Design an enzyme around this catalytic site. Sequence first.
Site, PDB file in Angstrom:
ATOM      1  N   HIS B  41      24.024  45.383  41.229  1.00 24.63           N
ATOM      2  CA  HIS B  41      24.115  45.227  42.688  1.00 24.63           C
ATOM      3  C   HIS B  41      24.608  46.513  43.387  1.00 24.63           C
ATOM      4  O   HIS B  41      24.627  46.553  44.605  1.00 24.63           O
ATOM      5  CB  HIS B  41      24.922  43.982  43.107  1.00 24.63           C
ATOM      6  CG  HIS B  41      26.393  44.089  42.930  1.00 24.63           C
ATOM      7  ND1 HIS B  41      27.040  43.449  41.879  1.00 24.63           N
ATOM      8  CD2 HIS B  41      27.322  44.677  43.721  1.00 24.63           C
ATOM      9  CE1 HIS B  41      28.334  43.699  42.050  1.00 24.63           C
ATOM     10  NE2 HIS B  41      28.550  44.448  43.135  1.00 24.63           N
ATOM     11  N   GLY B 143      35.132  46.515  45.699  1.00 24.98           N
ATOM     12  CA  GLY B 143      35.109  47.795  45.007  1.00 24.98           C
ATOM     13  C   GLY B 143      35.565  47.704  43.555  1.00 24.98           C
ATOM     14  O   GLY B 143      35.445  48.682  42.820  1.00 24.98           O
ATOM     15  N   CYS B 145      34.129  45.843  41.329  1.00 25.54           N
ATOM     16  CA  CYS B 145      32.927  45.596  40.527  1.00 25.54           C
ATOM     17  C   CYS B 145      32.674  46.730  39.548  1.00 25.54           C
ATOM     18  O   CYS B 145      32.925  47.896  39.875  1.00 25.54           O
ATOM     19  CB  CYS B 145      31.739  45.353  41.443  1.00 25.54           C
ATOM     20  SG  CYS B 145      32.022  44.003  42.608  1.00 25.54           S
TER      21      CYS B 145
HETATM   22  C1  LIG Z   1      28.940  42.002  49.532  1.00 27.89           C
HETATM   23  C2  LIG Z   1      29.217  42.299  48.094  1.00 27.89           C
HETATM   24  C3  LIG Z   1      30.332  41.436  47.547  1.00 27.89           C
HETATM   25  C4  LIG Z   1      30.331  41.310  46.016  1.00 27.89           C
HETATM   26  C5  LIG Z   1      31.674  40.752  45.545  1.00 27.89           C
HETATM   27  O1  LIG Z   1      31.843  39.557  45.338  1.00 27.89           O
HETATM   28  N1  LIG Z   1      32.662  41.668  45.437  1.00 27.89           N
HETATM   29  C6  LIG Z   1      33.998  41.353  45.089  1.00 27.89           C
HETATM   30  C7  LIG Z   1      34.371  41.157  43.761  1.00 27.89           C
HETATM   31  N2  LIG Z   1      35.607  40.811  43.387  1.00 27.89           N
HETATM   32  C8  LIG Z   1      36.519  40.653  44.352  1.00 27.89           C
HETATM   33  C9  LIG Z   1      36.248  40.831  45.693  1.00 27.89           C
HETATM   34  C10 LIG Z   1      34.963  41.175  46.095  1.00 27.89           C
HETATM   35  C11 LIG Z   1      34.616  41.262  47.561  1.00 27.89           C
HETATM   36  C12 LIG Z   1      29.219  40.387  45.539  1.00 27.89           C
HETATM   37  C13 LIG Z   1      28.923  39.208  46.214  1.00 27.89           C
HETATM   38  C14 LIG Z   1      28.030  38.292  45.681  1.00 27.89           C
HETATM   39  C15 LIG Z   1      27.404  38.547  44.471  1.00 27.89           C
HETATM   40  C16 LIG Z   1      27.674  39.736  43.826  1.00 27.89           C
HETATM   41 CL1  LIG Z   1      26.888  40.078  42.310  1.00 27.89          CL
HETATM   42  C17 LIG Z   1      28.564  40.658  44.342  1.00 27.89           C
END
Ligand SMILES: CCC[C@@H](C(=O)Nc1cnccc1C)c1cccc(Cl)c1
Lengths: 304, 304
Positions: B41, B143, B145
């Site tokens: 992503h 961030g 990820c």
């Molecule tokens: C708009 C991107 C947000 C990201 C996402 O959950 N990040 C994130 C991770 N851990 C803690 C906080 C956060 C904000 C995400 C959303 C939906 C699916 C996927 Cl694969 C990724």
Amino acid sequence: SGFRKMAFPSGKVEGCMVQVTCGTTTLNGLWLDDVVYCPRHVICTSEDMLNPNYEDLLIRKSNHNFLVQAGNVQLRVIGHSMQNCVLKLKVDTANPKTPKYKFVRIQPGQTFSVLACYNGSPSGVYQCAMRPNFTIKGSFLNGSCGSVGFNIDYDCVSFCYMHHMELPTGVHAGTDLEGNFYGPFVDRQTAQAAGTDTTITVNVLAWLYAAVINGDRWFLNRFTTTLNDFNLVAMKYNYEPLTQDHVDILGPLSAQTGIAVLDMCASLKELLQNGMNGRTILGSALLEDEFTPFDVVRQCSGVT
Amino acid sequence: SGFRKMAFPSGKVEGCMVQVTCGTTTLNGLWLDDVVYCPRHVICTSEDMLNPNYEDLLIRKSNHNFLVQAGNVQLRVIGHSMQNCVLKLKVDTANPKTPKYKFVRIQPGQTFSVLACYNGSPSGVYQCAMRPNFTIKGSFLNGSCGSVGFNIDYDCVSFCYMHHMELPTGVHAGTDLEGNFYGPFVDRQTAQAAGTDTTITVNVLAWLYAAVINGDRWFLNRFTTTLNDFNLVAMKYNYEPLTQDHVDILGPLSAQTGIAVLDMCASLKELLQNGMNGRTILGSALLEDEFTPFDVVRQCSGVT
Ligand SMILES: CCC[C@@H](C(=O)Nc1cnccc1C)c1cccc(Cl)c1
Ligand SMILES: CCC[C@@H](C(=O)Nc1cnccc1C)c1cccc(Cl)c1
């Protein structure tokens, strides 16, 4: 989101760990620049530990008696000296992996990470607090002596603790990196009273703010209190008295959530007087005091 | 003595963390040999995340679009490919700090350490369990990820998790290092049900043994039970059913303490039926399930 008992990344400290052997005893050393620091009881035998005369025991030792091994390489010891309860072994080679560092003496209620080591090898890392009575509730077995506690700011490791001993109560005691014990402890195998401990009030409040930030809000109430009233409850439940300095440090968390410090004190007062009623806060069924306000802001913002 | 939620020393993993940027998005990458692994992503924009067509989004990208930075040095990307939900960016330079490593797919109920990172920089390390429903209860902000979970045996890092997302419930989901999600999750910004979670029974029993080893014995009773009877209680309290395989893995802890596994099951049954009555076990006011039997033996013996 989420809230964890997070330790600092231990990499900069792992590169400083060495094994120190003197006679039959082996423990951990901290190699910074051309000096290896370790607990002075590395020179003791079993019979010595009951009432050791460290000045006399060290006089029987020479540079060649302290065997210092970093991983698989042997360090050449060119000097030795005792400073308080630590030994400083000057070596002929500066540690190439020496990070930027400071030696600090932390205050009770402050937190730090411990890198538990055995035979100079790291085994694990955990976060903990220096109790108000100067003990730490760690996880240490025989041979963990010399393991250190530290904090990291950007690229600077501030070493604050070196493990020396386990009290008969199963709690841990140690020194700053100048070898001064935290608390009244002596490096002797003798029964030693630790002070009456108290719960670190500022830390519980900081953790209550961390709970609100992460969604756990059931404990918030329609009440407020004053510093004097809150301190009467703190007294009854053996909590540290809250001062304006503690209120001041909670300022950013109060600003972020818009919950006034005294309103959070009233939630804490109600939790102390009523318990949790079988509920949890940030996965805990008790009031957590090992997170400082600084820790909460760091974890909640993303400080690397 | 003492028992802590100990994470593996993160040093070997810190040397693998890099920052990956593609367009406007920046996240973490894992640089092993001449390959950088990251969540796919990283190629998405805000509008894309609702329903991304990853094959089409990646076709618009070239090697020069993936900016990979290790500390302050820039890596030259000579290839890119998507494997399940991860991107593998082949670089022209093997990571000099690459430790011995394996990619493993852990089972639910197993534990691992997470090195939370932001902009390719490590911020903290914590231990956690892969829930029976394949989620993890971590601490991650935007961030984070690309941060990874791992275990270490001697000198070998087994990477088991890469963080991809936070579910609307505040729990975390991610993949193995081949990019296969644990659980039914998809890398889409859509509401996704996590399964009904259960408490990891074998881990609670292991932690009960750890409590006995460290002096907390108040919960031991004059009773015993059977696997069938214990499982009826486990069912009522949403605990995982205990099998002979779980009993077998508890063998060493049963041997060490001389407390038969079914006798420990009867203490756990009584704790489930009566609660803790305002008491604690290893500093916890609830039944802890994030320590496996392996973790307990490792921590209780001193494995480095
Ligand atoms: C708009 C991107 C947000 C990201 C996402 O959950 N990040 C994130 C991770 N851990 C803690 C906080 C956060 C904000 C995400 C959303 C939906 C699916 C996927 Cl694969 C990724
Ligand atoms: C006979 C040496 C034991 C050592 C000691 O407490 N080690 C130790 C440390 N942490 C956990 C477990 C252990 C066994 C010690 C005793 C008395 C005073 C001093 Cl300075 C050191």
